[PDB]
Amino acid sequence: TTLDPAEYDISSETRKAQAERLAIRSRLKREYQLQYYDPSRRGVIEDPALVRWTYARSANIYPNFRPNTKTSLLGALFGIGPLVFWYYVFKTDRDRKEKLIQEGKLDRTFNISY
Amino acid sequence: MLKYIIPTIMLMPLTWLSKNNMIWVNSTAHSLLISFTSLLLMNQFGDNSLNFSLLFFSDSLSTPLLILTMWLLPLMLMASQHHLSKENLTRKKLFITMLISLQLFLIMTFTAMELILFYILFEATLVPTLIIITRWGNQTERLNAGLYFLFYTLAGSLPLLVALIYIQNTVGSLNFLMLQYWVQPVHNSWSNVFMWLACMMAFMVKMPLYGLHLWLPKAHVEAPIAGSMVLAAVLLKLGGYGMLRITLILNPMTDFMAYPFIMLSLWGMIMTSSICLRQTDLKSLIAYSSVSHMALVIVAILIQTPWSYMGATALMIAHGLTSSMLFCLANSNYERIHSRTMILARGLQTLLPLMATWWLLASLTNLALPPTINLIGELFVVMSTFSWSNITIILMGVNMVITALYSLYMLIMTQRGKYTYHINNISPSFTRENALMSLHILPLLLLTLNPKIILGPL
Amino acid sequence: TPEEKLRLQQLRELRRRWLKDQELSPREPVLPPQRVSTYRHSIFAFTHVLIPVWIIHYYLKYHVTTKPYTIVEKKPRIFPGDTILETGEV
Amino acid sequence: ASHITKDMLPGPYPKTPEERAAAAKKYNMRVEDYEPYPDDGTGYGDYPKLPDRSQQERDPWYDWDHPDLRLNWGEPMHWDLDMYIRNRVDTSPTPVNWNLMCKHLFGFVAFMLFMFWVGETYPAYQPVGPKQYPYNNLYLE
Amino acid sequence: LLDLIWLEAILPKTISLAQMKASTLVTNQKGLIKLYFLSFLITILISMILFNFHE
Amino acid sequence: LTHQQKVLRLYKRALRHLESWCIHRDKYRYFACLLRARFDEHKNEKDMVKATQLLREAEEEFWHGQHPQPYIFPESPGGTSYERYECYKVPEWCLDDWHPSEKAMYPDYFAKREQWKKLRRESWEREVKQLQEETPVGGPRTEALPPARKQGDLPPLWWHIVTRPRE
């Protein structure tokens, strides 16, 4: 369970020109280490992958959002759903206890505390 | 307060009157001298009650609450000097005066003797705190958060004037809480429901609920320089104690509609704790913790019948020291790494071993180590609502289990390796960084020696 | 592979040379600096154990006369009858 | 102060090839199986162009991973897919899905019916009829 | 996705609703003094019939 | 990765998975040449599917029944006490701020500490002179000339040339 995870496949000779996808990152890695190695930096790297991460996660989701689907209105089945249900538990509670507290007794007589 | 507001207003014609950089050492020096005068004339006995002098003070008899109000001003000036010293001297001194002016209204508040002087002092704040968010804050999206900092508290508080003057012209006069001996009962109607509604709903604006609380992770997220007024915003949220003043009387018997305030603050309690285990901000990390076990106290009050007033007296000051101390941890580790995002802080615990003890004991106040001031009151919330019913221990106990992970979720983030970066962040925790980090647990466990003063009437 | 041949020859003349540099302790380089400065078993234990005996026993002799519940020692658990009483048992 | 493509935008079909990579190089030349098409399904509040999800996932697991640091500790430059669930999670082992533990817990499910029986030591079973005679029937004499 | 969306639905509707209805009040008043004063006689005629204004 | 060296990545672990299960040493050693005869089925042939079907049936009986909690050689990517030495953890360059009477000890060590920095302080008239030249446009893995055509210092100077030693 989670997952198989399909760690093996076929090759020879599927997509011969697909290689050098590391050329995207090794150019950045050359741009990384040249920024990393210097006689005076005294500070953190800008690292815009984390800049584009949180700000496009914490913010810019409500400008993305529209209620054009009911699977966006699907949160009614999770927020207000059990919130009625706990009161549906609790409204049945506290009154059945009260009727046995009003009519008849069940408690011990030394219940000062409470 | 005979002369408590009187010495501290004289501190105000001393900032711009003074010399150059002497203004920091002078302002801290006078400030601690008032702290003994607070301790001396208060803490007297004590049996119902100490009506203090006259129509302006009832001496905070049932709940002292006022010692904590006076630590912070000789505690944040040493904190705000981290990143403030870049401006003109006349502009920096104005930033000193507005924080001192914040204390003076709150010095008269929490005692207040009355209700018509309460609301004008209940609204006497929000003027200096708003200006702190506008000028000398952080990066943008400040101004909408300044507007969300308004337009909620002011939106809910205006029916109090609809409520209170409707009481003043009807039955006697609300100048005296102690002339509230004759109180007529309140029956179920369609007019009296709203009478209780406006009496209560404004107090839910400050201590939050699962509703209407989106503004709270804006002022703490977009915040001033290094937790400067954020420490004052801790007392601003807990300082909604006035429900203890009001609903103790003045329609007590309406509990038929108590239930949707019991339930909403209960499933919202367990929810907002887990709403931050995937948060990516440090100043938002303590903020959602500060919702949960601050929402614990509300069901301790609307449920009446003491053994609930006992712990709720102590649970206001519980995170009030703790979350103030956590913000002091978060105000640090930002002058050295100029982004507040927690993930970038891999590879700590080796460069700063001295403050690593302070991370341990601080987060050991959320697990809270039952001989402290935290789990001495949470056991009484257990002691109350279990007499309500047998179900209430379930959702309230998991709150003690989620924050067990949620506190140690922060501690383990300090322990990593090789740190990848950081030719900056050299500074091995200077004197201001650790002396200000003290004086939080140093009175806290001190109060755990004889915790007799932290008790209501009750 | 013939490419890394000039690699790791000057690196051993740099990394191990830095480790030749790192191996460095000139005449045990602690200064410390300034300043200075079994059978007894006379005060190492006497300060340890022999002193707090008298303090805490004073805290109990001055305790029973004040508090109305001192030590609450249980019953006798005696099968015969003995000289502490006057009667006997078979 | 980085304003040019500072975050994602209302995608995912505003010339998606010009998204990756004019900036936010999640794909090299919009054919890398990581072009910003994978807006899951949109309409919701998910990720837009979002240099984000359904890229190859389920673990950064701190592998051998020597060509850079590049696994989870040591900052590869720009390969963000998903985070905050993976500092404590892993890949697939040698066995597969088979939920034998419920069958392993079913070993007492046969003996859960045995919890209804009694456990007297002596005498032996002789389970044929009422000749076992458990309790007291008659008097002394 | 729920806390900053479906609680960001009801209250930021209120600002957009007022800004929708602040847009219908000024942009329809660009001069045309002939169109002002025919609406003031609408005010003075509707006051006769409607209510207690003559009784 | 290539098809011919894909055999090599399996061949070492084919025997490495076996010594996990053995009890003796010769019992494992007897199955080394015994498993070699299966490897000696197709000695040298073409690189087509005939070499892939030898690997396509090496999918089963290699992952199938693979290493029931094997040997791990504890200083490894996995294994216990793999990164245990972390109370020290080699904080290289934690030694900037001292405010001396704490820099009293090791006098000759600090005199040599500023000495090596001039090798790093003066390299970008040489290393960056070839850094613009050695990379064609934006291409592959960016090590320099391993002698740097006169004197290689390092090229990776100095955080890699003075990298963290283990203890």
UniProtKB/Swiss-Prot annotation, chain A:
The chain crosses the membrane at residues 71-90. InterPro entries: NADH_UbQ_OxRdtase_NDUFB4_su. GO terms for cellular component: mitochondrial inner membrane; mitochondrion; respiratory chain complex I. Its main location: mitochondrion. It is found in: Mitochondrion inner membrane. Coiled coil: none annotated. The modification Phosphoserine is found at residue 11. It is a single-pass membrane protein. Keywords: Acetylation, Electron transport, Membrane, Mitochondrion, Mitochondrion inner membrane, Phosphoprotein, Respiratory chain, Transmembrane, Transmembrane helix, Transport. Accessory subunit of the mitochondrial membrane respiratory chain NADH dehydrogenase (Complex I), that is believed not to be involved in catalysis. Complex I functions in the transfer of electrons from NADH to the respiratory chain. The immediate electron acceptor for the enzyme is believed to be ubiquinone. Belongs to the complex I NDUFB4 subunit family. PANTHER family: NADH DEHYDROGENASE [UBIQUINONE] 1 BETA SUBCOMPLEX SUBUNIT 4, NADH-UBIQUINONE OXIDOREDUCTASE B15 SUBUNIT. Complex I is composed of 45 different subunits. This is NADH dehydrogenase [ubiquinone] 1 beta subcomplex subunit 4. It comes from Bos taurus. The lineage of its organism: Eukaryota, Metazoa, Chordata, Craniata, Vertebrata.
From Swiss-Prot, chain B:
It is an enzyme of class 7 (translocase). Pfam families: Oxidored_q5_N, Proton_antipo_M. It catalyses: a ubiquinone + NADH + 5 H(+)(in) = a ubiquinol + NAD(+) + 4 H(+)(out). The chain crosses the membrane at residues 22-42, 60-80, 94-112, 116-138, 147-167, 196-216, 224-244, 256-276, 284-303, 308-330, 351-371, 393-413, 435-455. It is found in: Mitochondrion inner membrane. It comes from the Eukaryota. GO terms for biological process: aerobic respiration; electron transport coupled proton transport; mitochondrial electron transport, NADH to ubiquinone; mitochondrial respiratory chain complex I assembly. Its EC number is 7.1.1.2. InterPro entries: NADH4_N, NADH_Q_OxRdtase_chainM/4, NADH_UbQ_OxRdtase, ND/Mrp_TM. Core subunit of respiratory chain NADH dehydrogenase (Complex I) which is composed of 45 different subunits. Belongs to the complex I subunit 4 family. This is NADH-ubiquinone oxidoreductase chain 4. It comes from Bos taurus.
Swiss-Prot record, chain C:
It is a single-pass membrane protein. The modification N6-acetyllysine is found at residue 20. The keyword Nucleotidyltransferase does not apply. Its main location: mitochondrion. The chain crosses the membrane at residues 38-60. Accessory subunit of the mitochondrial membrane respiratory chain NADH dehydrogenase (Complex I), that is believed not to be involved in catalysis. Complex I functions in the transfer of electrons from NADH to the respiratory chain. The immediate electron acceptor for the enzyme is believed to be ubiquinone. This is NADH dehydrogenase [ubiquinone] 1 beta subcomplex subunit 6. It comes from Bos taurus (Bovine).
From Swiss-Prot, chain F:
InterPro entries: Complex1_LYR_dom (IPR008011), Complex1_LYR_NDUFB9_LYRM3 (IPR045292), NDUFB9 (IPR033034). The keyword Electron transport applies. Pfam families: Complex1_LYR (PF05347). It is found in: Mitochondrion inner membrane. Keywords: Acetylation, Electron transport, Membrane, Mitochondrion, Mitochondrion inner membrane, Phosphoprotein, Respiratory chain, Transport. It is a peripheral membrane protein. Residues 130-151 are annotated as: Disordered. GO terms for biological process: mitochondrial electron transport, NADH to ubiquinone. It comes from the Eukaryota. One of its GO terms (cellular component) is mitochondrion. Mammalian complex I is composed of 45 different subunits. Accessory subunit of the mitochondrial membrane respiratory chain NADH dehydrogenase (Complex I), that is believed to be not involved in catalysis. Complex I functions in the transfer of electrons from NADH to the respiratory chain. The immediate electron acceptor for the enzyme is believed to be ubiquinone. Belongs to the complex I LYR family. This is NADH dehydrogenase [ubiquinone] 1 beta subcomplex subunit 9. It comes from Bos taurus.
